[PDB]
Design a protein around this ligand. Sequence first.
Ligand SMILES: CC(C)(C)c1nc(-c2cccc(NS(=O)(=O)c3c(F)cccc3F)c2F)c(-c2ccnc(N)n2)s1
Ligand SMILES: CC(C)(C)c1nc(-c2cccc(NS(=O)(=O)c3c(F)cccc3F)c2F)c(-c2ccnc(N)n2)s1
Lengths: 249, 247
Amino acid sequence: DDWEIPDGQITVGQRIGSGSFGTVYKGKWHGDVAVKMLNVTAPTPQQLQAFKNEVGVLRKTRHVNILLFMGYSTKPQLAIVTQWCEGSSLYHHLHASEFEMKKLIDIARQTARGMDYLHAKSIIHRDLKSNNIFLHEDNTVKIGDFGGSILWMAPEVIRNPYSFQSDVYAFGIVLYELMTGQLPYSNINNRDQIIEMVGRGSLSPDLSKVRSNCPKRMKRLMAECLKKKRDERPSFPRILAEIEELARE
Amino acid sequence: DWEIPDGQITVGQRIGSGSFGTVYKGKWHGDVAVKMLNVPTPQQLQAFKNEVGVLRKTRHVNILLFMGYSTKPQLAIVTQWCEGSSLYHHLHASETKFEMKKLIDIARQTARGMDYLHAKSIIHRDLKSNNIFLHEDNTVKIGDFGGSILWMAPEVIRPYSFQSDVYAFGIVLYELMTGQLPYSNINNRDQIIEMVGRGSLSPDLSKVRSNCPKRMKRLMAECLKKKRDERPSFPRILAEIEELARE
Ligand SMILES: CC(C)(C)c1nc(-c2cccc(NS(=O)(=O)c3c(F)cccc3F)c2F)c(-c2ccnc(N)n2)s1
Ligand SMILES: CC(C)(C)c1nc(-c2cccc(NS(=O)(=O)c3c(F)cccc3F)c2F)c(-c2ccnc(N)n2)s1
């Protein structure tokens, strides 16, 4: 019932980087772990409060497609311990490296399962990117890094605009990455152009870029997820149903 | 709370019965395993909460992920679904050929889970090769917490402690390196019970394969000590496997 890991048990190691919040290092604790710490000399009451809140949210997650929360510590720095994922993110595999359709579908399915699970718990991700989707042992999708993210931002977010619908839009962009192998808006290299245009309602991902073997049901689902108006986007129960179905059919 | 309301879980094919309860494959935000408990009484409900209370305390990659419990239509526990088969099936049925590196990683992962369980002061009471699920063939998943006498420590046969878990892990180590179950040339349950229980019989270490690192042979022998207090603790066990893993 209590997930406080007494300090001195955790052997922190090499730094990996910084996500939406905190900084992560590879660690040692009953095996490999990832350790996200807030490196400040002394946490301001704001930081201590937010720390308690997010931990309270993370301890409500138990699903194979959600990064495993394992525990937390408060001294000397506030820290959150998670499982260690082997391999790289979906971003690296898609954009920084040299997948067959069946794998692409399965990745989409696992991600939908995780998101569907989160939404049923009334949890909004707020920062879903292919960057946040770790392919553990290249076989299991692990969603992490909750709240450069401009590409995955819904039009209303670009202009509290966060909701289940904005998560769905981000998921739609991830589908676009899986089915095209590309990041959206390749012919636009200006950050403010995309911000203006996507926000203006003018610009949307180019669905003609999808692969030939990409199923039409997937293509339709993608277009539904990418609706400019938020209340026109599908919910994850319907999203999961469609993917899981088409994976068979 | 981790109670899953009635109707959210779709039960599929029966998988089998374990140390307690009956397992089915199911649907709930993806694939799950549903362990049906055959039943509630006021007191049965308390015992149900106590076991769920223990399971709710585990958050580790090498421990089967608890996901929730059902009170209606009947008492049930929900866990993740593992793809593939048990370590037992690979070693003794499938005859899957593992390079020494895989066998030691599996041993290392199992050690990680057991060390975690013991740090939480949880005793498994029924660790064996078919309790160890190789999820997607790579990740060890220890489940089925407490007919299976091959993994029973002498003191258990004649009781349950961290030391008896260590012994059971020693037999698993034996399986990994030998490829066989202990006492293969003796197909008599009563005999093994009598002889292992009184201390006259122990696993034949001559049957370990040549490629097996000698440090693991020693560690295996240390785990299989007939006298309970001469067995090493899992933190020590993990380190030596971890140290040997460098190669
Ligand atoms: C590169 C980048 C983006 C900085 C990373 N952050 C994490 C990481 C490490 C710890 C937590 C969270 N995400 S979180 O903080 O939102 C979170 C929890 F703290 C607990 C449970 C789920 C969860 F998403 C992370 F994304 C990474 C991470 C986590 C596990 N294994 C590996 N190999 N990397 S990589
Ligand atoms: C009948 C047999 C072959 C022994 C099995 N039992 C389980 C199974 C199913 C559910 C729970 C537990 N073990 S448990 O009941 O002790 C337990 C929890 F309920 C929660 C967390 C850990 C844990 F070990 C299991 F072993 C199996 C199982 C579990 C997950 N995936 C698959 N494919 N099979 S297989």
